[PDB]
């Protein structure tokens, strides 16, 4: 949690939005993934959202589905993902790191153990994609016990009761699914700062999100497409990732 607080305070002092890339850990392999992540950070990522490959990701679109499949082709396991996370943290002490998880991988060897492992490697937040607020109690409780922010999605079809619950239960940031009024209401209820996600692929969308009152924007498919499109040239891949992240981050600045 604390890393997000520090980030948003720092960004607010610079009248600046957060730009937050998503990638799947171990796509297209462990080594290339570690390099990808270092490149995202060097290019100006303010935080990271990181997917752990799961067999049945029913909230992931085709682009992300294929990232998981590439990661699985490389033999990537949750255990290897946690080793990756420890090293990323050891390299980069302040950048917030969030995980995008599916419930079974969290519940598998015990909800408590999962969040304890997150805390040990230096993860800051966890969004469990198939756990709605209604089912979230054990997850959010375990997360808070281990100083991990539980992240909730605030979708379009969101009514006032849901806004209030998301505001009360969430920490770190609110995942605002792709909105001015939603943003005002979340602020009114003292919700965690909003990051807009879903379909963010161009600089103007980042500036738009910040203008609308969001604290930043998350981009996944756009980033993962660059990986998909450049599998044959790892060097070209990094270059294009650098270019894209730098442009997206620049759009967040005052």
């Amino acid at each position: 949690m604390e890393r997000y607080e520090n980030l948003f305070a720092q960004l607010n002092d610079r009248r600046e939005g957060a730009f937050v890339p998503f990638v799947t850990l171990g796509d297209p392999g462990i080594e290339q993934s570690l390099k990808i992540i270092d490149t995202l950070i060097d290019a100006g990522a303010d935080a990271l959202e990181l997917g752990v490959p799961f067999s049945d990701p029913l909230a992931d679109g085709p682009t992300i589905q294929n990232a998981n499949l590439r990661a699985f082709a490389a033999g990537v396991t949750p255990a290897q993902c946690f080793e990756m996370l420890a090293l990323i943290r050891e390299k980069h002490p302040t950048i917030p790191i969030g995980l995008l998880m599916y419930a079974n991988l969290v519940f598998n060897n015990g909800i408590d153990a999962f969040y304890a492992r997150c805390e040990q490697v230096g993860v800051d937040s966890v969004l469990v994609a198939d756990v709605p607020v209604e089912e979230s109690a054990p997850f959010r409780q375990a997360a808070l016990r281990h100083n991990i922010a539980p992240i909730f999605i605030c979708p379009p079809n969101a009514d006032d009761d849901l806004l209030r619950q998301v505001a009360s239960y969430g920490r770190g940031y609110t995942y605002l699914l792709s909105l001015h009024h939603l943003i005002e209401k979340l602020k009114e209820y003292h919700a965690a700062p909003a990051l807009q996600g879903f379909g963010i692929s161009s600089p103007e969308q980042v500036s738009a999100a910040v203008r609308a009152g969001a604290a930043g924007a998350i981009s996944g498919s756009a980033i993962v497409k660059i990986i998909e499109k450049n599998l044959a040239s790892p060097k070209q891949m990094l270059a294009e990732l650098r270019s894209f992240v730098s442009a997206m981050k620049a759009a967040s600045r005052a």
Partner: protein
Amino acid sequence: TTLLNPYFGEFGGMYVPQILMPALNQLEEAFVSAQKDPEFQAQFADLLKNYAGRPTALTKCQNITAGTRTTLYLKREDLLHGGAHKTNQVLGQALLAKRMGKSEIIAETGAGQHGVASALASALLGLKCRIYMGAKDVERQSPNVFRMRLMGAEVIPVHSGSATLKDACNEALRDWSGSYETAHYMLGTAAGPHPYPTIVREFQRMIGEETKAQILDKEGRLPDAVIACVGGGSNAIGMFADFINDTSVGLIGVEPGGHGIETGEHGAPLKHGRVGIYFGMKAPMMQTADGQIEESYSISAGLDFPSVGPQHAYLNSIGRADYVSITDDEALEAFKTLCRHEGIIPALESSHALAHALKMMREQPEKEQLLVVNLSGRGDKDIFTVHDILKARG
């Protein structure tokens, strides 16, 4: 909050992305409304009777049990329009869709029986039907794919993941997330997120209700046990439901043992899997030590759901129902026996239930017992499968 309890003990719930919750609440609401609405009940009854062919027979099998003190009846869901029990609840769910003002149907299918059922119901009731099926299953099930298309359904192959039933299940949810305002997701078993396990049971419970009336008429008492195969749990819970409060009636569910439990190549998550969270529910599943979901194996494609309905997991936990498994070879033997001795060709799914009844009889032939096996479907579809195996062995 919800109107009904989404849990059976620890099992069940609504583990879907937040965006799907309104669809589930809407459906629960419409279901609860429909269940109190005499016009809905009358319409559903009319379709079941005059279109689907209810009530189905309860057939006494006297040749099979000769020389034992077992009396065996078969509940004849094989005689239902479409050849399986799946028809009952697709009609109910299609009527619900119309009650909610939906014009479109999304369905998932494995062996294809539920897909055919969804397509026929949609044809009858003027709904636009689209069906998701794993590419591996599409390849294996050309006849059922073609039936769906003759009935005007759009069949969509799924290449993601293992390209089988669990992957079709995922893609079906993906779609509904974005289209639930005009489309209803017609889930094919008594599993998935609340309210589906409850809805499916309630739209299959006529199986057990009829069985009770029929057995009382013919024998003047209740069965010692009722026995049903368990893929996802719909035919079994439909048979069991009306007998749950009849404490003297045994409830026996049969999972596929495949090549044998000890081989690991089976489809018996309830008794040999591990509790997980997937497909909207907390339930026993086929999964790696790491928590990745795996496939169920069975000679019968229809018993391939890699988990089981949460109400079964609950009934097991409290000891109200007992679950067992039957291997490919035991199911095959039961299939052959029913054909030769009774002139009924059973689905290979249902043959698992029959096989366990045959074991109860043969193991203890002087035990007096009255058994009902839910014959969930006909086995015309399995003729080629059984042919080839019997050919491969000689």
